[PDB]
């Protein structure tokens, strides 16, 4: 059975960056609301002896949309962080050098693909296969976790990831963005 | 060079049940850019000089994506009216009891399949080829004017459609949906 895993800092921490009322809809009713209808949906299936993420690899429509979306908000909330954001140092900032050519080209490549991912979706930073960083956007539910790259950093734009905060513009929420990464969350990631 | 049409009511006409606020920024703002791309991506093209219709139907991408939204929200302020909502009469509910036995069978289905269209999208009422009524939900930009199917009917589900007034209660804003619905226009475009 799945429980809505702690938020990791308090609901106003990330504020004015993304504000607490933008908490408590975002994790308080959407990431619950998935958590909720995942469990009823796979309730007396075969897919509630696995675990998120073989659900996720091995299924379709409404029980894959619930089970990735719970999995890629609580990889979200752990990329964000207060008293983080600035530019990385350490194997992620020569990773990032090394497949982008500098931290200002990976920036402007992320916010760009951010900004034109067109309706609902999710912007990733993923190490490929090869070991080579690569920026990847899905639609709605898509995940990294269908395919052999190694998800990194994501950053949501739903629109109800900056609506109350920024309304239409989307470009302001993503500025914000940036201010909040946690880099340590991404070391993690990349070296596992 | 398309022009945005001008909106049929005031922008407090639609209040309590889609508030000024929201069309501020869903006319003011998201179709007022949509327009504008469009514009841009068009000029110097085989596409400048067409009408939105044969734009739509023969392109795919950004162009299709622009074009799609800016015919999709003046179709669904068209759906919209003070001092409407109810029930139908006349021709239109003759066919609407004919396709779906009731009109309280019609509402809750049409309410069902806009609240399940999952992610950004836009259900519809549409009428077939052989003169029956369905509802249709597509995703993103997606529109029955790319099928053979004629449109009759319309709601956004795009977060930007609700977001300020309803949050993430979807049902809610479906619910006031109905007191907006101008049959007027449902009757224009069924004997089209
Ligand atoms: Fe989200
Ligand atoms: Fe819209």
Chains 1, 2 share one sequence.
């Not at 696995?50 to 719970?70: D, H, M, P, T």
Request: charged share 15%; net charge negative.
């Amino acid at each position: 059975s799945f429980e809505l895993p702690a938020l990791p800092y308090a609901k106003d921490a990330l504020a004015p960056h993304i504000s607490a009322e933008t908490i408590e809809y975002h994790y308080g009713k959407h990431h619950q609301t998935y958590v909720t209808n995942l469990n009823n949906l796979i309730k007396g299936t075969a897919f509630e002896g696995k675990s998120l993420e073989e659900i996720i690899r091995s299924s379709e429509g409404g029980v894959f949309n619930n089970a990735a979306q719970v999995w890629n908000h609580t990889f979200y909330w752990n990329c964000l962080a207060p008293n983080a954001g600035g530019e990385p140092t350490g194997k992620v900032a020569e990773a990032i050098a090394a497949s982008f050519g500098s931290f200002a080209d990976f920036k402007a490549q992320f916010t760009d693909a951010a900004i034109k991912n067109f309706g609902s979706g999710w912007t990733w930073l993923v190490k490929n296969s090869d070991g080579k960083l690569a920026i990847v956007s899905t639609s709605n539910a898509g995940t990294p976790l269908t395919t052999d790259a190694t998800p990194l950093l994501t950053v949501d734009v739903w629109e109800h990831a900056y609506y109350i905060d920024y309304r239409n513009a989307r470009p302001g929420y993503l500025e914000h963005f940036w201010a909040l990464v946690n880099w340590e969350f991404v070391a993690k990631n990349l070296a596992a």
